[PDB]
Design a protein around this nucleic acid. Structure first.
Lengths: 114, 54, 136, 117, 178
RNA sequence: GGUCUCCUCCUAAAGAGUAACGGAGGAGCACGAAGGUUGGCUAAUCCUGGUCGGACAUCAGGAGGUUAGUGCAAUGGCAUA
RNA sequence: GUCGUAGUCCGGAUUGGAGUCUGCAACUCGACUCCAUGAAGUCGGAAUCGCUAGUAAUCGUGGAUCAGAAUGCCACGGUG
RNA sequence: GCCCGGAUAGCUCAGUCGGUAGAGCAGGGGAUUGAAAAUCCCCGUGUCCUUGGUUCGAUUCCGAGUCCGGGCACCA
C-alpha cells in the first residue's frame, strides 16, 4: 500500500506519483516502471497485487526515506567533523558549494536577523 | 445626445426662494444626488440642493 | 543612386503642380554629367540611364548618380474632369540643371556616360572636377 | 532648491512686476546663518533697498543669538522701521520658496507696525 | 549608530591613505540603499501580493511605497496605473542598521553562498544587490511565507568611480568572497 | 455616384480675405470633476548595474536637451507649465 | 501492539549516490544490495474474460532453458 | 470603371462590446468485424486574405489592395 512503507500515493499517474517516495525522481521512478511493465498512464489504483507490489520489488535497490537521510546526515558529518572548509561552513549554515555568502543567501543562512 | 442613458439636463433648484439654475449631468455615473451653492434672487448663496438630493 | 523610381517609401500626400528655377550642385566622385536645360526625369529614365551605363565593361567602378525624385504626377483616362486625379504611377523628378553621375574609376567615361545620355530627357554636358578647390 | 532647477513655481509670483508693477516686494532670504531682506521698487527701480542683518545696529555684529521667531523677527524689524516710508505704499514679502517658520517670523515681524496690507 | 562609527573610527582612514586624497569629506560616503521587490501580477496584483509589502515593510521597519507603473499598452497587459512595486529606501540612521543587519546577519543565507558579486558595480560606484528569496531577515512567525517576490536593494554611495569604489565597501563588509 | 451645416492645415502671392465634384482629416462630445484656488512636481528614450529578466515590468545611478504629456482631428500654444 | 481514513504508517514507478556476482567483457544492453528520491494511482465508460468444488479466489514452494537477465511456461501444496 | 457584400481548420461554413475561435464533414488513434463499411470512444498543427494605421494589445476598429460574389456601365 505504501511500497517503501508509509505514504500511500493514490489517484495519480504511476511515475508522477511514484516520485512521492522521499528518494526517487522524475527519472528514477520512471526507469523502474520500464523493467516493471507498469505504465505511467495507469493510476496506482488501476494496478493489482501483481502490479503495485511488483514496484515494491525493484525499489529495494535504492536507499529511501528515514535512514537514507540519516545515512547522509552522518556521512556529511564524516567529512564535516574534519576541519575542512566545507564542514566549517556546513556547521554554520553557510554555502559550501560556491555562493556569495556575503549577501543574498536567505534560504541558505536562514531568516532575517535585523 | 438625448439618449436615456447619457447626459441629460439638471433642472436644479434652491431651498426656498424659487430659483432655477440649470446644468447637465449623466445617469449611469453616480447620480440621484446633487447640491452646490450658486447665487439666488439676491443676498447669500447656500443650499441649492437641486433635484437628486443626498 | 538608383531610381526604381523607388517610391519615397510610401504615400504621405501626392499633389502639388510644378515650378523650376536654378541648379544647386558640384561633384562627389570623379566623372560627372552636368544637367543644363530645365526639365524633369521620367524617373523611369534614371533606370534607363543606369541600365545603359554598363554594357562592355563589368559592373566594375563605383557608379553613383545622385538625384532623388519625390514628385507624384497622376493623369486621367478617357474621362471628363472631376478634377481629382487618379493614381500617380509616373514620378517625374524635378531637374533644373544640377548634374549628377559618378564613375569612381580611372578611365574614359565621357564616351561611356554619353552612351546613356540619349536615354536622358534632354541635352547635358559632362565636365568632371576630379577634385575640389572649386568650393571651400 | 535652485541647483537642480529654477523651472519651479518659485518664480511665478516674483513676476509680480507685471500688473502689480508698483507692487514692491521684500524677497527675504534663508541661508542657514542669516536671513537678509531688502526692499526695492518692482524692477523699474532696483535703485532702492532696506537692510539684512546689518551687523552694526545696537552693538557691532547685531548682538543677537538664536534664529527662531526670536532672531528671525528682528531680521525684518530693521527693514521695517527703517523703511517707514514704504509701508502704506503696500509692499509685499515674496516667500521665495516656502512661507513657514523662519520666513514667517520674518514676514509677520513686519506686519506689526509696518507694511499695511 | 552601529557601524556608522566604524566609518570615521577605522574606515575613513584607509581611503585617506589608499587612493590618497586630503579631505575627510572626499572620503567615500554611503548615501542610501533602497530595496524594492519587482515582478507584479499583470492581472492578479490585489489581495495576492499586497501582503508582499507587509514583509518589506517590517523587514526595513518603515512604510512601503508599493510604487506604480509608467508603461503603456504594448505587450504585457497593463496600462500604466497599477502598483506592482515596493521601493522603500533608507538613508537615515536606520540605513546603517540594515547594514549592521546584513553583513553580520545572513549575507550568507543560501547553500549556494560564497560571497558578494565582485563585478556588479553600477559603473560609477554604487552596487546593486539582488538574491532571490527566503526572508534572510527573520522577524515573522515563519509559518506563513508565500515566497513573497524577493528583494533587489541597491546601496547608493558618493563613490567617484567603479574601481574607485570597491575598496570602500571592501572595508566593513565581512562578506564579499575571495 | 457624391455633397449639401460646423472645426483644423495647404492652396492663399510673409495684414485680412478670396474659388474649384482641389490635396488631407476631425465635430453633432466628454467632465460633482477633466472647474476654482493654494502648495508642490517635471518628460520620452537609451547605457550600466538588480531575484523572480532572457525585447520592454517596479529599483539604482548616469546620459536625461519642446524628440514627452495635453480628454478627441489639425494648427497654434504650453516649464511661471 | 501500533498506525486511524489524509494520498497516508498506502502504493511503489522514476532518478540520483555508491556498491556486488556472474562472465574476455556487462556503455550500448544484465541480476541483485545498501542509502536517498517516493510519481501516477483514492477500484477504472463503452465493451469484454475465466471460473460449477478443494473449483473460482488468494498464499507461498520448486523446475526446464541457463555462466549470469522471469512478474512468462510447467508444476506442487495451504486456506477456501 | 462604378457601388454593395465575402475572404476564419483540408472542404463548406458559424462566430467575437478588442486580449487565449468553433460546428457538420474529411483527417487521425483506439474499439467492435472474419474483413470492410455503418456505428462507439479520444483527438484542431488555424500565423482568422494582404498592407498600412488607432492601441499597451487587432481575426475583430480605421484607410487602402488583391481576389471572389451581386448589381451597373445608360441618351449617343
Amino acid at each position: 500500500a505504501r511500497i517503501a512503507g508509509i505514504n500511500i500515493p493514490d489517484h495519480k499517474h504511476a511515475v508522477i506519483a511514484l516520485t512521492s517516495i522521499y528518494g526517487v525522481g522524475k527519472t528514477r521512478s520512471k526507469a523502474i516502471l520500464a523493467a516493471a511493465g507498469i505504465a505511467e498512464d495507469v493510476k496506482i489504483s488501476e494496478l493489482s497485487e501483481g502490479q503495485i507490489d511488483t514496484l515494491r520489488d525493484e525499489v529495494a535497490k535504492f536507499v529511501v526515506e528515514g535512514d537514507l537521510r540519516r545515512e547522509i546526515s552522518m556521512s556529511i558529518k564524516r567529512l564535516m567533523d574534519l576541519g575542512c572548509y566545507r564542514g566549517l561552513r556546513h556547521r554554520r549554515g553557510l554555502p559550501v558549494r560556491g555562493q556569495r555568502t556575503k549577501t543574498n543567501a536567505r534560504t541558505r543562512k536562514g531568516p532575517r536577523k535585523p | 445626445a438625448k439618449g436615456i442613458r447619457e447626459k441629460i439636463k439638471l433642472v436644479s433648484s434652491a431651498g426656498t426662494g424659487h430659483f432655477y439654475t440649470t446644468t447637465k449631468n449623466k445617469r449611469t455615473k453616480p447620480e440621484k444626488l446633487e447640491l452646490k451653492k450658486f447665487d439666488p434672487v439676491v443676498r447669500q448663496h447656500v443650499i441649492y440642493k437641486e433635484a437628486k438630493i443626498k | 543612386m538608383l531610381q526604381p523610381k523607388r517610391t519615397k517609401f510610401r504615400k504621405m500626400h501626392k499633389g502639388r503642380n510644378r515650378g523650376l528655377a536654378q541648379g544647386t550642385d558640384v561633384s562627389f566622385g570623379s566623372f560627372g554629367l552636368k544637367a543644363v536645360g530645365r526639365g524633369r526625369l521620367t524617373a523611369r529614365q534614371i533606370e534607363a540611364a543606369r541600365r545603359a551605363m554598363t554594357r562592355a565593361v563589368k559592373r566594375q567602378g563605383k557608379i553613383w548618380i545622385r538625384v532623388f525624385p519625390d514628385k507624384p504626377i497622376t493623369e486621367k483616362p478617357l474621362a471628363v474632369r472631376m478634377g481629382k486625379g487618379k493614381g500617380n504611377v509616373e514620378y517625374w523628378v524635378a531637374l533644373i540643371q544640377p548634374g549628377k553621375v559618378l564613375y569612381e574609376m580611372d578611365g574614359v567615361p565621357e564616351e561611356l556616360a554619353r552612351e546613356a545620355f540619349k536615354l536622358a530627357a534632354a541635352k547635358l554636358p559632362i565636365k568632371t572636377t576630379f577634385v575640389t578647390k572649386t568650393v571651400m | 532648491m535652485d541647483k537642480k532647477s529654477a523651472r519651479i513655481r518659485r518664480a511665478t509670483r516674483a513676476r509680480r512686476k507685471l500688473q502689480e508693477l508698483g507692487a514692491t516686494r521684500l524677497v527675504v532670504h534663508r541661508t542657514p546663518r542669516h536671513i537678509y531682506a531688502q526692499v526695492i521698487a518692482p524692477n523699474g527701480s532696483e535703485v532702492l533697498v532696506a537692510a539684512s542683518t546689518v551687523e552694526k545696529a545696537i552693538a557691532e555684529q547685531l548682538k543677537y543669538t538664536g534664529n527662531k521667531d526670536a532672531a528671525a523677527a528682528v531680521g525684518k524689524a530693521v527693514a521695517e522701521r527703517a523703511l517707514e516710508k514704504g509701508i502704506k505704499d503696500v509692499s509685499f514679502d515674496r516667500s521665495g520658496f516656502q512661507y513657514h517658520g523662519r520666513v514667517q517670523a520674518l514676514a509677520d515681524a513686519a506686519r506689526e507696525a509696518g507694511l499695511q496690507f | 549608530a552601529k557601524l556608522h562609527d566604524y566609518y570615521k573610527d577605522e574606515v575613513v582612514k584607509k581611503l585617506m591613505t589608499e587612493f590618497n586624497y586630503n579631505s575627510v569629506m572626499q572620503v567615500p560616503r554611503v548615501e542610501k540603499i533602497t530595496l524594492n521587490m519587482g515582478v507584479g501580477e499583470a492581472i492578479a496584483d490585489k489581495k495576492l501580493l499586497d501582503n508582499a509589502a507587509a514583509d518589506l515593510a517590517a523587514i526595513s521597519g518603515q512604510k512601503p511605497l508599493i510604487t506604480k507603473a509608467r508603461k503603456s499598452v504594448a505587450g504585457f497587459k497593463i496600462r500604466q496605473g497599477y502598483p506592482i512595486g515596493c521601493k522603500v529606501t533608507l538613508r537615515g540612521e536606520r540605513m546603517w542598521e540594515f547594514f549592521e543587519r546584513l553583513i553580520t546577519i545572513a549575507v550568507p543565507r543560501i547553500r549556494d553562498f560564497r560571497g558578494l558579486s565582485a563585478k556588479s558595480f553600477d559603473g560609477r560606484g554604487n552596487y546593486s544587490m539582488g538574491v532571490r528569496e527566503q526572508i534572510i531577515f527573520p522577524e515573522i512567525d515563519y509559518d506563513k511565507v508565500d515566497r513573497v517576490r524577493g528583494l533587489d536593494i541597491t546601496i547608493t554611495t558618493t563613490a567617484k568611480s567603479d574601481e574607485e569604489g570597491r575598496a570602500l565597501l571592501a572595508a566593513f563588509d565581512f562578506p564579499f568572497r575571495k
